[PDB]
Every structure is written in C-alpha cells, then in structure tokens.
Structure 1
Amino acid sequence: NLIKFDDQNKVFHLHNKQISYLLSIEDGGTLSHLYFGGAVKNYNNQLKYPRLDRGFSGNLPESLDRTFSRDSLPKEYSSAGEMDFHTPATIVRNPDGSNALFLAYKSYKIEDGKPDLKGLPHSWTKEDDEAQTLIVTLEDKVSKLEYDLLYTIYRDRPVIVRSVQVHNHGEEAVYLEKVASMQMDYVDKDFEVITLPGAHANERRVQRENIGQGIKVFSSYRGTSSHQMNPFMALVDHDTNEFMGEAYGFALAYSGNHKFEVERDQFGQIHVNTGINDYNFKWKLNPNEEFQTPEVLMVYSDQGLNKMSQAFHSLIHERIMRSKFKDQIRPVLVNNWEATYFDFNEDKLKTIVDKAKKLGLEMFVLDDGWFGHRDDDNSSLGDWKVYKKKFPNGLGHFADYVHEQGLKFGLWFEPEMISYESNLYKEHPDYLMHVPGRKPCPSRNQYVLELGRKEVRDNIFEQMVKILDSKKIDYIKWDMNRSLSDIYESDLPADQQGEAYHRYVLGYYDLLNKLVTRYPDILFEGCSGGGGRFDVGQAYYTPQIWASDNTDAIERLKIQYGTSLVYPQSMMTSHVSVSPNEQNGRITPFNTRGAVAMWGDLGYELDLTKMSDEESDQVVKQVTEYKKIREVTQFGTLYRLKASASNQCAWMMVDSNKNEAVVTVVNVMAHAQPYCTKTKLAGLDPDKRYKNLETDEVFGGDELMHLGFYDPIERGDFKAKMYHFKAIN
C-alpha cells in the first residue's frame, strides 16, 4: 500500500502520488536517511552513501572498516556515546554516570492509521485507509532501552509525521536528558532556512537566512512555544518563493519548550533535529515505563511556499483540530479589552452590547476584569468567581441580557495563573510555582500554578465548571500572560525536577482537554498575551487563537503573513481597533483596519458607544460585506501574493471548486511619484470566466492569473482595496 519494506536490500519506502521517503538499515544496524522529496515508484540502491576514510570520523565497535562511520553517514536519529559528533537527537544518563547510548536496529512494524499519542495533541485519521504508520525499533543491548521511531504517511497529502517513544526494559532507571522527535540529514543540499521570530506585539515575522557550518538553534525556554520564536522552520532552495521551488517545512505539535537545530557539518551535509528543548529536561524513565515525544509535521512542496503552507493548513484544519466549530463560520464578535481595559461595570458593558446589536454583531466577549476584585492586573488570578461590585446581580444576569439582545456571550479566563493577592493563594499558597526557599520572580505581577499536580488542576477545573455548566457562556478566551521562570514541582523528588517543564505542559493539556471535551458546545479561542502559544499542539484544542496584542493594521500585515506560513487563516483572529493605534500610535484608515482584520476571523475591539453615526454606519457596512464573503475568506485556499517589504501586502482566498475568490491588496507607504503596479491572481481555473462583483466585468481565469490588473493609484498612506470574483455559468 503506502509503505513497503524490502528485506533483501533493507530499505523502507513510504510513498504516495506526491512524495517518497526512503530510509535504510546500514552497517551496525545504523538507521540511515536516504531521501525525502517528490515520489518515485521504485528504489535501486543508488543512494548507498559513499564509503570514505574520513579523518577523525571513527568506526563501529570492534570494526576494522575505517570507511564507515556514524559521524559521517546521514541518519534518521543519533545519540551521545556512538562516535557521532553532530548535535545528537538523544542523550541518556545511566546509573554508572555515563552518557552512553548505542542504538542498533531491532525490528519494524507497519500499521494502518496512526496511533494516538498518550497525553499529547496529535494528528489523527477518520478512517484507517487514510494513512499508514511505520514504526522502527532501535535497541541498546547493554542498557536495554528501546526507541520506537514512528513515521506516518497520509494517502493524499505531501506529509510525513514523525515522533519517538522510548521504553526502558532494564532493571534500573535511566534519565533522558534529550529526546528529539525526529532527525533528518541531507546530502548535497544548499538550503536557506526560514523561521518566524518575534516578540510580544511583534510575532512571526518571516526571516530567511543562509546556513553556514556550525549549528543554528531556534528555540524556547519560556515553558510555552513563545512569541519570540515559533516552533516551525522551513528549508528552501535559494530560488524558492511563494510560487515555485522546493520547500521542506517542519512544525512541532507542542506548546512548551522547543528546539530546532540546523547543523551544516564538516562534509557539507545538513543535519536537522526537532523536539522538546533539552534545557532543564531530565526525565526519569523507570523500568517498564515509556516516554512519548510530541510529533513533528513534515511537508514537502515541489512548487513554492504557498503550496507548502496549504498542505499544513489542510492537515491542521482537517486532521488535527477536533472542535465541532472547526468547520463552522466564526462569529463577528466585539471584545471590550481595548475599549475599556479594566474600567467598566455592567451598565457600561450593557451599552456596548446594545450598540453591537444595532451594528449587526453576533457575540459580545467579556474580557479581563470581571472576577475576584480584578480592578487592574495586580490581583485576583485564581479567584474565578464574579466581581459583585461590577456585576451586582451576578454574571448570569449579564449573560442573560446579552442573549436577550440576540448575541452570543463569551468570557475570558486565565486558568494557569495565580496572584499573591487572591483567595486562592491565601487558601493554597503551595499551589504557586516556585523553588522552595527562594522568592520567585514576578511577571505582570503574577505567578504560575503547579499544573503538574492533579489537585491544583482539579481546583481550577471545579471553579470553571461552576460557571460553565449553566451553558450561558458560548465562547471562552483562554489567556496566559507570563513565561515560566522558577522551575520546580513541589511533589516530585529532587531527581525528577528536570520533569517540571514538561509535566507543566502535560498538565495544561490534561486540564484543557478535559474542558474542551466536557464543553464541545463552546467555541474556545486560545490566547497568550496575543500569539505567545500559537502552535499545532494548541490547534488540537482551540480552533482559533488571538494572533497578537498588536492590533495595528500595518504591523498586522507582517504578523498575519508570517502566521499564515504554517497556520490556516481560520485559526487566527483579527480585530478592528481604534486609531491612533494603542500599541504603536499609527494612524490608519478605518477601511484598512477592516480589510486587514478580514484575513483572520473578524471582530471589533473598541468602544462602539463612542463612535459617531458616520463611523457606526461604516461598521454596519463592513459587517454586512464580511457576512457575504466570510465562508471564502475563513475557509478558502489561501495564496499570499505580495509581501509588505515590497511596500504592498496582498493575499487571496479561493473556494474549493475555484468558483469564488476574495482578494485584498494593501499599499503601505504613499509616494508622490508612484510606480504603476499590477496584481496577478492565483489558484483559479484558467478555463472559467470570473465576474468582478463590483464592476460586473468578466475575465477568464487565465487573464486574471497571467495579465492581472492595475492597482488603483491614490494619495495617502496605508490604503487597501478588496475584490470579489465569482465564476459565471
């Protein structure tokens, strides 16, 4: 079917109509990486690695053959202690104090479907014939450890998914100091590497670099996937762009500390590892226990970055996300945060609800400040009960009002966190994450809960269920506003404190999973001070995520473009906010804020009651137009057309039958003497005829893609134009 093992040449071949992945068993049972790329029907031993005596690249135990070395061969995995001097995929500490591991091929199996990953998010299948999974087992015969390397291929996608499971079949514990989810080594490739660095209010700009000898590391230590470096990278040809050239993308399905390593070695080979960061990672694996890594999604495109992205979008949306809302149009909501910050009460919010109804909005989301005595960000996290001074008749009274006005109701929570000034801390001070004897460091004047402890998760779960069981809350914004700094888990022995970071993430996933599965009828939006936990692991739980606290239309071009390299546009949310912008002071046209906020799932986040009639009618118009196009903008195939560094940013979405397209083009800096520019479309049927719904003119798909059209020339910075095309019969 999709996976074959040739027991004569010792070669495994995963293939479909799009891709082939080839690996082999080499001397000493060494698992070698041969190829990943466009599909081939057969393999005939022509990628056997040349045998050369390479100075200082040593040999197998007891071997006299100097021309084979685990330090030169391209491999599917590696360890410390095996005569390999690359950065190793795994490191084990044994009872004798050594870091020795020497893995050798033991066995394989080929299964239909793919296995569920215990305690972790993962891609899945709806029917077993959708995919097959090869599991290759490697063993160390001295320490009695086994490593299972999982490889899944879907029948109709250019994707390989990899993870690792470690098993201790010995008599004593070992400590896992590093366990990568995968390793792949390329020969004779001269790639550039694309990543998505950033910061708070500045996430996921596209960065592209040459690769020199040495190791380039893209990672997080913050206990989250982070604002500063997304858990993603792509390796591309120098000449790859959005529409042509090869690209290998790698996205780690994990929401904690990650590490992507790209090493160009002494023989010009490019060695890649991806997995949980090894920083303060030391997992005690007792006899008869197992450790499962998160998985990595690997995409191959033979025709540019849009095709790569589209494969991630489809896999994430169709076979990772589990929400019942993933295929439902997302509501046009208003969120009060930038509108009021903490300065509100029920009467104030009711006026916003009234205005939202008149403007045609579909949901009101109550943001931070509704609980405990939360007058600012210096108290009350952990006290998930209504602030009576703000809501004198309780929270249900307000939710009922929202529903009576014809809107859905959403509510913000920050379940992982605790304030010193909280009843929770007064009752359970040991729930706050710190190293005993050391005052912890604050961040936004708050601290992190010990979510690795079941009793701590149970407390928060019971508080939330007491609100949520009423079914008055249709939507939850689940936020998380600081990194982890004081790394400890108070119920673990000293020798297990290297488990604290990963147990925190496991605990987060357990609590979140319990809530999203109890409440399939609630739309969950992830948040972490914006996009600080914006990853494929998170998608499994929340089908949309607040992309950034930066709501400036213009900086959002950069953030949304980078986000879309991996993540489907329905997974990112985008709100029209006030001008001048609250984060950078930029002044933008209202129409430009709307256009950029229709790339993600549109919402509004400004005090609607302060708008003039002229501005309010503009909201009505934006909302009315978005409702006509949002099935296509939220779920259509995304093509990025122009990047903001060109002075324009442009993108479009096309429905699955290529019958409808919505295109947006934004010009950044105005010029007194501008060059004429054209926009060309993509993803259309060259033989269909498309009507421009604004002008009623009709153009062949071939014309729209090859000729394009001239962009309007207007004065003023930060101007946008949208186009809507529909195929005629």
Structure 2
Amino acid sequence: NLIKFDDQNKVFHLHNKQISYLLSIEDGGTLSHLYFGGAVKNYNNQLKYPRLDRGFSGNLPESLDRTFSRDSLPKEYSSAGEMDFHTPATIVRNPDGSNALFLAYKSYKIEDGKPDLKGLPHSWTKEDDEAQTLIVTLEDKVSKLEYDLLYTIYRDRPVIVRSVQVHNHGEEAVYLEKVASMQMDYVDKDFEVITLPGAHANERRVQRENIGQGIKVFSSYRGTSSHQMNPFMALVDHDTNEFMGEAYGFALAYSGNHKFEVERDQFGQIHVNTGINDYNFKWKLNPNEEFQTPEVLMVYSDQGLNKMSQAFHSLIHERIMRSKFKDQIRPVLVNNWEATYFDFNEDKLKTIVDKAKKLGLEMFVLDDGWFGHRDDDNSSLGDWKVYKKKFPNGLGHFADYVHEQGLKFGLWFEPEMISYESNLYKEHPDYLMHVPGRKPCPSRNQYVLELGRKEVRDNIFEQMVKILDSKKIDYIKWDMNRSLSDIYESDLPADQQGEAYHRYVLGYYDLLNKLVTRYPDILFEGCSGGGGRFDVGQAYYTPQIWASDNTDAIERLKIQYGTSLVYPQSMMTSHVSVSPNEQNGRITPFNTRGAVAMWGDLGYELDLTKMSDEESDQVVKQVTEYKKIREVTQFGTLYRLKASASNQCAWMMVDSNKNEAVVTVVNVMAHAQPYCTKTKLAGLDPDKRYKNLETDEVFGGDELMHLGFYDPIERGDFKAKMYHFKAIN
C-alpha cells in the first residue's frame, strides 16, 4: 500500500501522492538515506552513493574495499565506534567502559496505523487505513542491543514521522548517553537553515542562516523546550520564501531538553540529528528493558513556507491534540494579571467581572495570587488552597458569582513549583529538587518539585482535585515560571542521575495527562512565563498556550509570525493589554492592539474598569466583530503575507471551502513621505467572486491574488486595518 520493500536492490519506498521517502540496505547492512521529497512512482538505483577512496574515511571491519565508508555514506542513523566522525545519532556506554556500538540491518516489519508511544505525547490515527509504519530493526551482535527505527507515512499528508526504540537483549546493563529520534543525510544540497530563537518576553523570531562546514547546534537544557530556542528547524533552498520553493520542516514532539544538530562535512554533505539533548543524559537500560524516544514530525513542501506550515497546523490540530475543545471556538476571556498583579481581593475582581459582562466577554480567569498567602511572588507555591484574606467566603462563592453573570470561570495553577515559605516545604522539604549537600539556586525566588517521584505528583494531584471536583472551574491556566538548575532525583542511585531531566518530563506528562483526562470538560491553556514550553508535545495535552508575556501589539507581530511557522493559530492566545505597554513602554492605538490579538485566540488583560468610555466602546465593537469572524480566524487556513522587518506585517485566514477570508495589515513606522504599498491575497479560488463586506465591492479571486489592492495611506505609527471577504452566488 503506502510502504513497499524491493528485495532485489534492498530499497524501502514510502510513497503517497505528495511525497516519496527512499532508504536502502547498503554494504555492511548499513541503512542509507536516499531521498525525501516529491513523490516518484518508481526507483531504479540511480541514487546509489558513488564509490571513492577518500583519505582518512576508513572502512567496515575486515573489509578490503576502501571506496565504501560509514564516514561518507549518507545514512538514516549512526553511532560512536563505527568509524564515522560526524556527530553520532546514538552513543552507548558498555560495561567494559567503551562507547562502542556497531549497528547492522537485522529485519523489518510493515504495519497499519502507528504504535502508541508509552508515557509520551505522539501523533495518532482515526482509521488504521489512513497510515502505515515501517519498523527497521538494527542490531549490534556483540552488545546484543537492537534499535527499532520507526517511520510513519499518512496517506493524505506530506509528512513522515520518525522515532526510535532501543531494546537490551543482553545479560548486562548498558547506558544510553544519547539517542536521537532521527537522522537525515543529504548530498549536493546548498540549504539555508531556519530556526526560532528568542528570550523571555521575546520568543520565536524567525532566524535564517547559511550552513558552513562544522556543526550548528540549536538546543535547550533548561528542563523545558524553552523561550530561547524552540524545538524546530527548517531546511530551505536559498530562494524559498512564503509562497514558493522547497522546504523541509522538523518539529520534535517533546517538552524537555532538545538538540537539533546541523552539520556540513568535509565532502559538502549535510547531516542532521534531532532528539533529546544528550547533555547530562545517561539512561540505564537493564536486560530486557526498552527505551522509547519522542517522535519528530517531518514535513516536505514543494511550494513555500506557508504550505509547509499549513501541513504542520493540520497534523497538530487533527491528529495530535486530544482535547474535546480542539474544534470548538475559544472564549473571549478577561485575565486579571496585568490588570491588578497581586494587589486585588474578591470585591475588586467582582467589579472587573461586572464590566466584562457589559462588554460581552465570555469568561473570567483568576490569575496568580488567589492561594496560600500569595501577596507577591516570594511565597506559597505548593499550597494550592484559597487565600482567605482575599476570598473571605471561599473560592466557590466567587466562582458562583462569575457564573451568575453569564461568564465561564478560569483558574491559574503552577503545579510544578515550590517556595521555601510554604506549608508544603515545611511538611515535605525533600520534595524540593536539589543536589543534597548543595544550596539550590533560586529563580523568581522559587524552586522546582521532584516530579520524577510518584509521591510528589500524588500530593499535588490530590490538592488540585480537591478544588476541581466541584466542577465550578471551566478552564485552567497551567503556568511554570523557571528553568531546572539543580539536577538530581533523590530516590535514584548515583549511577542513574543522568535520568533526572527526562524522568522529570515523563512525570510532568503523567501528572498533566491525569488531570486533563479526569476533567475532559475543562479547557486547559498551557503557559511558562509565556511561551517557554510551546511545542508539539504540549499540544497533545493543551489545545492553546499563552504565546508570550510580551503583550505589545508591535513586538507580538514577530512572536506570532514566528510561532505560526509551526503552530496553528488556535493554539496561541493573545490579549489586548494596556498602553503604554507594561513590558517595553511602547505607546500603541487601542485598535492595533485589538487587531493583533485577533490573530491568536482573543482575550483581554487590563483593568477594564479603568478604560475610558471610548476604549469600552472599542472593546464592545472588537468583541462583537470577533464573534462574527472567529470561526475563520481561529480555524481557517493561515497564510503569512508580509513580515514586519519590511515595515508591514500581514496575514489572513481562509475557510476550508475558500468562501470566506479575513485579512489583517499592520503598518509599523509612519513616514512623512510614504511609499504606496499594495497587499495581495493568497489561498482564494480564482473563479469565485468575493464581496468586501465593508465596502460591498466585489472582486474575482484572481484579482485579489494578482492585482491585490492599495493599503490606505495614514499618518501615525503602529496602525492596522482588517478586511472580511465572502464569496457571493
């Protein structure tokens, strides 16, 4: 069906209408990568790697053929100790102290659908016939280890999904010092690389570079996927842009330490690994045990980055996210954090609720400060019980009030964290993650829990169900405000402390899965001081994620633009916040804040009771208009049109039948002598006729995409305009 093995020339071919993926069994049972790209009907050996004696690239054991080398062949995988000098995909530590591993082809099987990954988020299928998986097994006969390489192709997607499962069939333990989820080697490709670096309050700007000889590394070891480097990269041709050219995307489905490596070697070849970062990673694999890596989603586009991005959005939204809310319009909420910070009580919050109701908002979210005795960020983490001074009648009483006003109710937690000045720390001080005999380093004056221990998770779990069993909470904002610095797990032997990072993430997933599974009618929004854990693995549990603590309309342009490179727009949230902006002091028009916050799932995060009449009227109009378009903005096909470095940022959504489109154009710097700009649309049907619903003028889809229209000329920095088109009969 989708996957065939030609036993004549030892070539595996994964194939659908859009893509072909070819790999083969070369000399020494070496698994060789041939091709990933546009579909071909057949293969006829034209990509067999040329034989050449290359100085200092050595050969297979006992071989006299100097023209074949594992140091030059493009491959599907690699290891330390096989006469390869590229950065290896896997590294094993053997009882004799060596790091040797020499993998050779053993067998394969082809099966329908794709197997569940134990303890990890993963992509899946609705019907078994919609995908197939190839599992190629390699073995080292001396250490008796077997590596299963998994490859999944979906029938209807330009996607290959890969991961690795290691098995110890020997009599002694080994340690896994590194296990990449995949490796891909290219020949005669002159790619550029695109990644999404950033910082707190500055996530995921698009960065794009040449690849020189050596290794470029994009990674995190913060215990999280991180603000500073998203687990994603794309390889593109020099000329690829948003609308044309080839692109290969690689998204790692994992929310902890990642490592993407892009190496160009001495023969001009590009070698790529992705998976769990090997930094302090050393997994003890006992006899008869197995280790499963997270998976990587790989997308090929033959036609620009929007098309690449759209394939990620569709896969994530349709075959990764489990939430019952994933296909449901998301509520327009007010969140009180920037509005009040810690300085509030119930009565203060009730006036905000009352104002939210008059403005037509749909949900009120209670943010940090409701619990323990949290008056500031120096205490109380670990004590998930209401702070009575602020809620004298309990939380249920406030929740009832919110519901009474026609609003849903949301609540913030930070389940992974603990403060010295908490009841939790006084009763269970060993729950705090640290190295015994060493003072731990603080970050935001708090510390991290040992989520690798069941007892620790059970305690936090029980605290939480005590609040959530009332079913008065409709939504949970799950936050996480520091990286891991003191890496240890107190109940493991010394020789297993290389497991602490990954066991932390497994425990996080386990606790999280337990809560979203127990409360399927709760909308969970992920958060980590903004977008510090914004990845495909997280999507599996939370259908939306706070993109950034930076709520400036202008800096949000670059953050939402970069985020959309991988993640569907319904997965990121965006709030209208006060001006001057609280993080950078920028002054922006209220209407621009609105229009930028409608790209993600719209909400409000400012003190609504302090808005002028004029601002309130604008909120009324924004919310009324958003309710009419949000099915299209939240779930339509997304096209990036213009990137902010150009002084304009523009994007649009089109519904799946191309009958309706919503376009936004934002101008950054004003100029006294402005150049005329045009905006051209994308993704319309050239033979439909579209009415501009503001002006009632009608335009062929062909006109909107080829002619476009003039952006209106106006004075003032930071101005936006929106357009709404609908196909007529």
- Shorter chain as denominator, the TM-score bin is over 0.9
- Equivalent-residue separation in structure 2 for 1:483 and 1:356 (angstroms): 35
1:627, distance to aligned residue in structure 2 (A): 0.2
Q: SS state of the match for residue 368, structure 1?
A: coil
* Residues paired across the two proteins, number: 729
Q: Distance in 2 between the 1:197 and 1:596 partners?
A: 21
Task: State yes or no: 1:343 paired with 2:343.
Answer: yes
Are 2:655 and 1:667 aligned?
Answer: no
Residues 602-644 of structure 1: per-residue CA shift (max 9 Å, x gap): 0000000111222111100000000000000000000000000
CA shift for structure 1 position 580: 0.2
Cα distance in structure 1, aligned partners of 2:229 and 2:18? 30
After superposition, the C-alpha distances for 1:258-295 in whole angstroms (9 at most, x for unaligned) are 00000000000000000000000000000000000000
1:569 — aligned with what? 569
Which secondary structure state, in structure 2, belongs to the residue aligned with residue 31 of structure 1? Answer: strand
Question: SS of 2:190's equivalent?
Answer: coil
How big is the shift at 1:544?
0.2
1:543-581 alpha-carbon deviations (Å, 9 max, x no partner):
000000000000000000000000000000000000000
Per-residue CA distance 1:658-705 (angstroms, 9 max, x = gap):
000000000000000000000000000000000000000000000000
Task: Give the whole-Å Cα distance in 2 for the aligned partners of 1:612 and 1:556.
Answer: 24
User: How far apart are the structure 2 equivalents of 1:198 and 1:646?
Assistant: 20
Matches of 2:47 and 2:685, distance apart in 1: 39
Deviation at 1:239, TM superposition (A): 0.1
Q: Deviations over 1:156-197 (max 9, x none)?
A: 000000000000000000000000000000000000000000
CA shift, 1:541, in A, is 0.2
Offset at residue 391 of structure 1 (A) = 0.1
Mapped to 2, the partners of 1:142 and 1:15 lie a distance apart of: 35
- Residues 130-156 of structure 1 deviation map (CA, whole Å, 9 limit, x = unaligned): 100000000000000000000000000
User: How far has the Cα of 1:484 moved from its partner?
Assistant: 0.1
The two structures have a TM-score, normalised by structure 1, of 1.00
Q: State the secondary structure of the residue aligned to 1:314.
A: helix
Aligned partners of 2:260 and 2:574: how far apart in 1? 29
1:283 aligns with 2:283: yes
3-state secondary structure, aligned to 1:353: helix
1:194-213 equivalence runs, <5 A? 194-213=194-213
Taking the aligned partners of 1:300 and 1:84, their CA distance within structure 2 comes to 28
Separation in 2, partners of 1:130, 1:672: 57
1:693, 1:593 → 2: CA distance?
22
Runs of 4+ in 1 over 2 A off after TM superposition: none
Where 2:402 maps in the other structure, the secondary structure is helix
The Cα shift of 1:470 comes to 0.6
* SS of aligned partner of 2:702: helix
> SS at 1:621's partner residue?
helix
What per-residue deviation string (whole Å, max 9, x for no partner) do you get for residues 77-97 of structure 1?
000000000000000000000
Secondary structure in 1 aligned to 2:641?
strand
Cα offsets for 1:358-399 (capped at 9, x unmatched): 000000000000000000000000000000000000000000
Q: Percent identity?
A: 100
> Structure 2 CA distance, aligned partners of 1:192 and 1:612?
49
| Cα separation, 2, equivalents of 1:609 and 1:674 | 38
- Deviation per CA, 1:5-62, whole angstroms, max 9, x where unpaired? 1111100000000000000000000000000000000000110000100000000000
Query: How many Å separate the matches in 1 of 2:549 and 2:53?
Result: 55
Post-superposition Cα deviations, 1:384-440, rounded to whole Å, max 9, x if no partner, equal 000000000000000000000000000000000000000000000000000000000
Query: Could you tell me how far apart the structure 2 residues matched to 1:466 and 1:109 are?
Result: 47
Deviations along 1:452-497, one digit per CA (max 9) or x if unpaired, are 0000000000000000011100000000000000000000000000
Displacement of 1:202 in angstroms is 0.2
Give me the whole-angstrom Cα distance separating, in 1, the residues matched to 2:195 and 2:341.
33
Query: Could you give the per-residue CA deviations for residues 515-553 of structure 1, whole angstroms, max 9, x where no partner exists?
Result: 011111000000000000000000000000000000000
Output the CA distance in 1 between the equivalents of 2:589 and 2:320.
37
Counterpart in 1 of 2:688? 688
The DSSP-based 3-state class of the residue aligned with 2:365 is: strand
In structure 2, the partner of 1:639 is 639
Other-structure match for 1:397: 397
Give the corresponding residue for 1:163: 163
Alignment of 1:80-91 (within 5 A): 80-91=80-91
Partner of 1:186: 186
Q: Distance in 2 between matches of 1:498 and 1:289?
A: 17
SS of aligned partner of 2:699: strand
Distance 2:680 2:612 in 1: 38
Match of 1:512 in 2: 512
CA distance in 2, matches of 1:469, 1:133: 40
**Aligned partners of 1:497 and 1:254: how far apart in 2?**
20
1:586 to partner: Cα distance = 0.2
Secondary structure of the structure 2 residue equivalent to 1:507: helix
Q: Secondary structure at the match of 1:300?
A: strand
Inter-partner Cα distance in structure 1 for 2:194 and 2:137 = 32
Q: Deviations over 1:577-614 (max 9, x none)?
A: 00000000000000000000000000000000111222
3-state SS in 2 of match to 1:506: helix
Question: How does 1:534-545 map onto structure 2 within 5 Å?
Answer: 534-545=534-545
Where do 1:93-242 residues align within 5 Å?
93-242=93-242
Mapped partners of 1:250, 1:102: distance in 2:
27
CA distance in 1, matches of 2:516, 2:125: 19
Q: SS where residue 575 of structure 1 aligns?
A: strand
Structure 1 residues 205-230: Cα deviation after superposition (integer angstroms, max 9, x where no partner):
00000000000000001000000000
Per the normalisation by structure 2, the TM-score is 1.00
Q: Distance in 2 between matches of 1:423 and 1:135?
A: 50
**Mapped partners of 1:600, 1:80: distance in 2:** 44
Please state whether the residue corresponding to 1:115 is helix, strand or coil. coil
Quick one: distance in 1 between partners of 2:38 and 2:60?
Answer: 33
**Aligned residue in 1 for 2:603:** 603
**SS state at 1:557 partner:** helix
1:299-337 superposed Cα distances (whole Å, 9 cap, x missing partner): 000000000000000000000000000000000000000
| Equivalent residue number for residue 311 of structure 2 | 311
Q: Distance in 2 between matches of 1:524 and 1:669?
A: 37
Partner SS, residue 275 of structure 2: strand
**Partner SS state of residue 541, structure 1:** coil
Provide the rounded CA distance (Å) in 2 between the counterparts of 1:615 and 1:61. 76
- In the alignment, the residues of structure 2 paired with residue 187 and residue 613 of structure 1 have an alpha-carbon distance, to the nearest angstrom, of 63
For the residues of structure 2 that align with 1:297 and 1:519, how far apart are their CA atoms?
28
Match of residue 380 from structure 1? 380
2:321 partner SS: coil
Distance 2:111 2:379 in 1: 52
CA distance in 2, matches of 1:424, 1:127: 46
Q: Find the residue that maps to 1:696 and give its secondary structure.
A: coil
CA-based RMSD of the aligned residues comes to: 0.3
Is 1:425 the counterpart of 2:425? The answer is yes
Secondary structure of 2:356's counterpart equals helix
Secondary structure in 1 aligned to 2:704? helix
What's the offset of the Cα at 1:507? 0.2
